[PDB]
Design a protein around this ligand. Structure first.
Ligand SMILES: [Zn+2]
Length: 258
């Protein structure tokens, strides 16, 4: 009876195995744009992805991850609200069964069709497993997807999903450039939060970009053909793998822009 997104093991049940689900800095949250505070001391984001080395794409049974070589400072995030250098380790998405839902964060209660998470870890802790035990261990860049025109930089991801349809399948996935997934503007909101899947650790500085990227209906439709289950098990479509918004409690969301 492992955790998942179904009726009997979904997010409303996670607190029984992971009691930090009712913690003080859980994610995602609703971003109220009128009570976010403009902070003029926030620095612009520095995204340095020109030497990124992708390695593999994997269906882990709740999402698919594109994994990167994080043994050197090749694809790093700096600046913004961060102190120090954060290395890119993987990205993944959350999406819905319908275009009107799928994102984890919401903006004035508005849901997007999907949400991209680029996960980075603080190099001063030496490896990802150590970083997740620290309050400043991870920085996650969150990008909203809306349905409209196609995103050409996403198509290489879409076309290999047939090869990793079921849980535990992986495929070689080299020379993918994550710069093709970024919007034009890097204006952002930021707040302290958590991983949005178990173990739900409160180790994340969230950086949520204001500008969504557009993807086509055909692109998101191919996300919905993946399976939660392993091969040879009954088919359950991988859809609605998003956690609902959690209470903000004693946190303030800051904005880099007026
Ligand atoms: Zn995520």
């Amino acid at each position: 009876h492992h955790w998942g997104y179904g009726k009997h093991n979904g997010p409303e049940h996670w607190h029984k195995d992971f009691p930090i689900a009712k913690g003080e800095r859980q994610s995602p949250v609703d971003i109220d744009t009128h009570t976010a505070k403009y902070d003029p001391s926030l620095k612009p984001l520095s995204v340095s992805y020109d030497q990124a080395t992708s390695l593999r794409i994997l269906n882990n049974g709740h999402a698919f991850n594109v994994e990167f070589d994080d043994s050197q400072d090749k694809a790093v995030l700096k600046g913004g609200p961060l102190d120090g250098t954060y290395r890119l380790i993987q990205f993944h998405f959350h999406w819905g069964s319908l275009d009107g839902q799928g994102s984890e964060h919401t903006v004035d209660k508005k849901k997007y069709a999907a949400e991209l998470h680029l996960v980075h870890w603080n190099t001063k802790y030496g490896d990802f497993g150590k970083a997740v035990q620290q309050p400043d261990g991870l920085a996650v860049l969150g990008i909203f997807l809306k349905v409209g025109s196609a995103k050409p930089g996403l198509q290489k991801v879409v076309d290999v999903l047939d090869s990793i349809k079921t849980k535990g399948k992986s495929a070689d996935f080299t020379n993918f450039d994550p710069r093709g997934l970024l919007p034009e503007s890097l204006d952002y909101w930021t707040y302290p939060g958590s991983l949005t899947t178990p173990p739900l650790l409160e180790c994340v500085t969230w950086i949520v970009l204001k500008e969504p990227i557009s993807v086509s209906s055909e692109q998101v439709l191919k996300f919905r053909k993946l399976n939660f289950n392993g091969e040879g098990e009954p088919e359950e479509l991988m859809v609605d793998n998003w956690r609902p918004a959690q209470p903000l409690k004693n946190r303030q969301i800051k904005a880099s822009f007026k």
